[PDB]
């Protein structure tokens, strides 16, 4: 009679598989960032944590594991081993190859693809239903490798993408406004990093258009040099880095967004990276930023945004940039 | 005018002073997890970051405002100068003195005096009325060293105790038991220690006594060994670091908990550090955890628990050791 | 092409398959009293509300449906036809017979079963797999009703039981000792109303027991008159509807709760109603309150609580007075 | 020794203000909505429930108080004395005269004065640095009636406005476009009911304007009708009406969000009845709702839409006609 019997009488053994499962691949700053986001913001009802780094996985899952009775999470797991994935509605990828010194963007990709053989493959063997969000960098390559290799639909690869730099850009434009970043309105798209594309045409508060009011926006003769405001953002990662290390907090935040739109099936508007073939001219398989739709199946619509003659001209370059790298990579 | 003023008429500039603000002091991960645990339980309508390492502080600072769009926390600041921490509530200090290979426990408790005897009034400069949570360690003796130096009254200093000891006893409970943290019920008293005292008496689920179902329990001929529940609540931070490195995310999460039973005023029981000369046959000014009613003005009551006597031994051994340390500070 | 399709380039056909989906049967004040409570604990991606009275619920729903923007629950639906209840993980049933002055207690529960014999298996016919909470009254009756008519197993047939009436209890307590409810526990078991179980061992703030601390703890010597808490208990409905007409918030919250344990998979223990055919020497087919761990199989496992052989005997009566009733109800 | 002495020792107290209370005058549905939907979002740690129905007003604060267990809002009091309203950091106003079959505009405003008052004067009696949020019924007039009475400064008075007709017209947009209401922008602005203003130029979805689109958007020869959107928006609340009794759960919620920016000090913007005395013709004391920075002391700032002259002359003419009301007045 053990106590657990004389205290507890079982009505029913049966049970398997979870209901809204959430793994997080990679357990690195960024990683846990994105794992103590999504914890707290009651997203998931199980939460896998995936990496090599045996002893450190084992670690991060104790620590988060005791914080158990402060939160609506009950079932914590980790493993080196995929079998701990298994029915993931959305799974997070922030693995990959850390930088060496000498070493060439393509070896960096390549290596990451090299990884990704890995990974993707026993990701959609164990949750073949999940989708797929892509935070590691550079993300809107590594969203086009694990589309590859993953084989699954194009609405279920999501990379990471702009949303952050697009929630930088809103707190950028709050902080001069003196409003709240909710209230400021502002998207970047384009290639995720140094040759973003700031829309001033879609800038606002409460709808009165920034770039009507003041005509000069976004460009050299601008009094304002509101187009440091997008140097911020470009920089932001960067000077966040140098300071501390690396980013973690707003980009934990920024992907526990996104897996909540997902999660929740909000149908909220992002922008994310994504297969942009056909759409502005561009004719490869290159994934770029562009606002669009989130919910349970991933990337449902997307939202055509009117670009310039200039602005159109720059997501071109990023992407024959894109794809200059992504035809060099090897699968097989 | 600018853009910001054809767009936005001022109707009044107006100082504001911070209604519901949280300084966390010294930005380490156990810093960090507990800034990131407070925004996102939304506790506060300001948090301010202080450390001695600008570069690293100011990183933080930046990098939790880059996601102030996902937060309705609206002024994170950070410095090194305390006047940062105006008009805070509740001020958290995790800071303090990094232990040297063979260093004696007493002396490093010193060099702790020293770096409060610099943080503590600062602190109390800037923010008179507020509560103090200590989360640095060694616990209960640093918050007898911040009282002292602060010349609060004993209610406005509170340890962080056996707050999370009890939370991971929990846990444990739960996992042996197949029921969620929040169900299973026990009480980690005393040293936040390896000296901490498990309540076995107290241990319920529906508030059914484990004790008096199976009373072989915590006992050294119980074949169930419950006893090593305890023994793992003790060699958690251990086993993590050893692990990990450090611990922060159930620390983190904890802390967050008193910040919030503190700045929503709940009087909820929590076991904290307090002075409690005068409780058990405890005759100095020494402080351990006992469940406290915490409140907006810290501690208002706390409960008696009834103990054996080999349990209120170990408590006032506990306080003959931490007075013995205590005795040979030196403050003035 | 529209604007719509301008605007918006769609990618996929939405299938449109609902993931965690509630339904509240009856627009009450009962009714959306969960409605709501629901929409503001985020645990759905899908709400249904269905009852007869069809210019009423479309504009309730139509109501809810306005705050949209302020809640992340992207789909509220409602209908007289139980078609929109539909791959529901959870119908919690409000719906039930308005007493008339001068019958019988028996008939009332009669009607009762014949209209459980319309609406219940025309909830099953639609959402075979979904947990049923049964509010309605008397309930620890509707749900031996509920069970019949839906032949769930009896794990997916949950009474609201005595889940709000521990809630008063620890509401009432916590007054007394000036204490959140969170940290008095308590618990009130048996047969919702009058006959219900305040079970005085069980009762504890920290681990002690009252009962212990002053053994008196209702007795009616007691100098405090702790049994009063109790009355107060049984009363509180009856007290609230001669003031208003009607109870719904606090009912509302306690069926929130019930529900997140059950969507969000946390095996808490509820005192919830189930079939004790076996415990407590009832032989019968009953239901009654008793701690139960709730999941998203509904309850799992049910919590032994020990019992003075009086308050065995108040719930032994409780199952007989309520067997008769059941036996007499016509069903085919 | 009572069982209290035995369990808690008690430490020696200080006092005791409450830190972010919020009372809700009148507890009609959408008070009690007010009340449910404030509690629930955490932004309190006292609420104060105040009417002239007594029995009524207890049994809901008991209700609430039974939940106390499932809620972090340790202190409900209720009562006919306005003493249970002191330290209200916001007093949510929506108490108010009832429309007659019989009565006209007029006669009903005069009342609602007077109502305003007995209550208005005994809510900054007993916190006198209150938010007042006036909800009331018929709401630029008795925002400006409020403002009168209570003699605070314009922007610690802040009507409702058309913050609910926005997020009407945003669910609305949604239902089309295959999208969130939080990613569907649009702005209901002005007089709150029939002469409300939805700001065409304005609506978006992801920054890309939709008057720009389809710019027959909102005008009549418009082939998908999106001025139906608009009638549909002063239509609904005078609709639910028809369907259910009165309005609450979308009236709580909009409240709540106007709450949660003015208790968390959010400054995020918001379509409320503020005093445009300076815009668009407005020579007028008019309170009318256009976009405003809701921070802890109120309406701290608002922007100045660009509006379309018929869009500026229905304010206008909004402001005219209110100004024609307010000035047969009297206190
Ligand atoms: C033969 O099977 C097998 N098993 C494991 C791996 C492998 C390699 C690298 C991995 C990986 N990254 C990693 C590992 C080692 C070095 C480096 C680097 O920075 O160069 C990067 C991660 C991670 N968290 O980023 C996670 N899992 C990995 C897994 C692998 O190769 C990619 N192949
Ligand atoms: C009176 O002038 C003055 N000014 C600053 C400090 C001082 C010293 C150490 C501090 C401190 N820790 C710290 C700093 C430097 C060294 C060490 C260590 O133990 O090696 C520890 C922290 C922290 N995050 O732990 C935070 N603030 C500090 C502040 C100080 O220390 C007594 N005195
Ligand atoms: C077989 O066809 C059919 N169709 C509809 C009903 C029926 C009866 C009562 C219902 C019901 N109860 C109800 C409705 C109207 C009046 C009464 C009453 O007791 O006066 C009770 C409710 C509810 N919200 O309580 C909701 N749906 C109902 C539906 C019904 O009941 C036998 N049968
Ligand atoms: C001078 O003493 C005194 N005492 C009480 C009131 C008074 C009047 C109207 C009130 C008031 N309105 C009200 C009360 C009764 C009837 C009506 C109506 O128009 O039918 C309107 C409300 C509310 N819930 O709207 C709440 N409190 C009130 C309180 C009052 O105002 C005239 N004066």
Chains 1, 2, 3 share one sequence.
Request: hydrophobic fraction near 40%; include cysteine; charge should be neutral.
């Amino acid at each position: 009679a053990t106590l657990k019997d004389q205290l507890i009488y079982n009505l029913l053994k049966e049970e398997q598989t979870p209901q809204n499962k959430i793994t997080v691949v990679g357990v690195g700053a960024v990683g846990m960032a994105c794992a103590i986001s999504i914890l707290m913001k009651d997203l998931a009802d199980e939460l896998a944590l995936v990496d090599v780094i045996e002893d450190k996985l084992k670690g991060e899952m104790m620590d988060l594991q005791h914080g158990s009775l402060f939160l609506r999470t009950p079932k914590i797991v980790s493993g080196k081993d995929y079998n701990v994935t298994a029915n993931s509605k959305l799974v997070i990828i922030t693995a990959g190859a850390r930088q060496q010194e000498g070493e060439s963007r393509l070896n960096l990709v390549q290596r990451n693809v090299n990884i990704f053989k890995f990974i993707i493959p026993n990701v959609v063997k164990y949750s073949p239903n999940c989708k797929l969000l892509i935070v590691s960098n550079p993300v809107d390559i590594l969203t086009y490798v694990a589309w590859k290799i993953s084989g699954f639909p194009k609405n279920r690869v999501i990379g990471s993408g702009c949303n952050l730099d697009s929630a930088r850009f809103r707190y950028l434009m709050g902080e001069r406004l003196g409003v709240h970043p909710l209230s400021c309105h502002g998207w970047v798209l384009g290639e995720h990093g140094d040759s973003s594309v700031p829309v001033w045409s879609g800038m606002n508060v409460a709808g009165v258009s920034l770039k009507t009011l003041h005509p000069d926006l976004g460009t050299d003769k601008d009094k304002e040099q509101w187009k440091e405001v997008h140097k911020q953002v470009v920089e932001s990662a960067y000077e966040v880095i140098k300071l501390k290390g690396y980013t973690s907090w707003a980009i934990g935040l920024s992907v526990a967004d996104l897996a909540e739109s997902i999660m929740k099936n909000l149908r909220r508007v992002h922008p994310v990276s994504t297969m942009i073939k056909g759409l502005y001219g561009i004719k490869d398989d290159v994934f770029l930023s562009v606002p669009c739709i989130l919910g349970q199946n991933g990337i449902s619509d997307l939202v055509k945004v009117t670009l310039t003659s200039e602005e159109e001209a720059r997501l071109k370059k990023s992407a024959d940039t894109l794809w200059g790298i992504q035809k060099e990579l090897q699968f097989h």
